[PDB]
Amino acid sequence: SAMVEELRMSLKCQRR
Amino acid sequence: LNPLSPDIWMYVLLACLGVSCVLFVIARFSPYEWYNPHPCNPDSDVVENNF
Amino acid sequence: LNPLSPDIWMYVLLACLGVSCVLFVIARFSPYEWYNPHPCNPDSDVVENNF
């Protein structure tokens, strides 16, 4: 579940 | 420009680049700064970061 | 009025009217200050400027 967010904090050009 | 020694004028300019590049990492990594825009509009989860 | 010389009180005022007119011309020229004023309605064309 933390690994779901470890990819989610790396969009870099956000809006997601 | 003299009342700070000319190393201090470089260490406060490395501290601007030091803090603004650690404020950038923490504001992304913390899941509480990821606020939701569109405060009146409901979901589909288009949360974003202003840092 | 004394601690600054009566000429250098005018170099402040010419800079205060100088920079405030350079900031206005750049803010209209720059294509990144022209933002969308409706967050809740993103896909419209009412792109405005607050300078």
Ligand SMILES: CCCCCCCC/C=C\CCCCCCCC(=O)O[C@@H](COC(=O)CCCCCCCCCCCCCCC)COP(=O)([O-])OCC[N+](C)(C)C
């Ligand atoms: C967009 C521009 C327009 C709008 C601007 C805002 C509006 C107006 C803004 C300010 C209004 C006030 C006028 C400013 C000057 C007044 C002060 C003065 O006396 O002259 C000063 C500068 O004079 C010089 O010697 C010229 C040196 C270069 C100045 C131009 C910068 C070019 C940048 C080049 C590099 C760029 C690099 C960029 C990348 C890093 C000093 O003169 P002095 O010799 O000390 O005087 C002798 C007196 N004494 C013997 C008693 C000591």
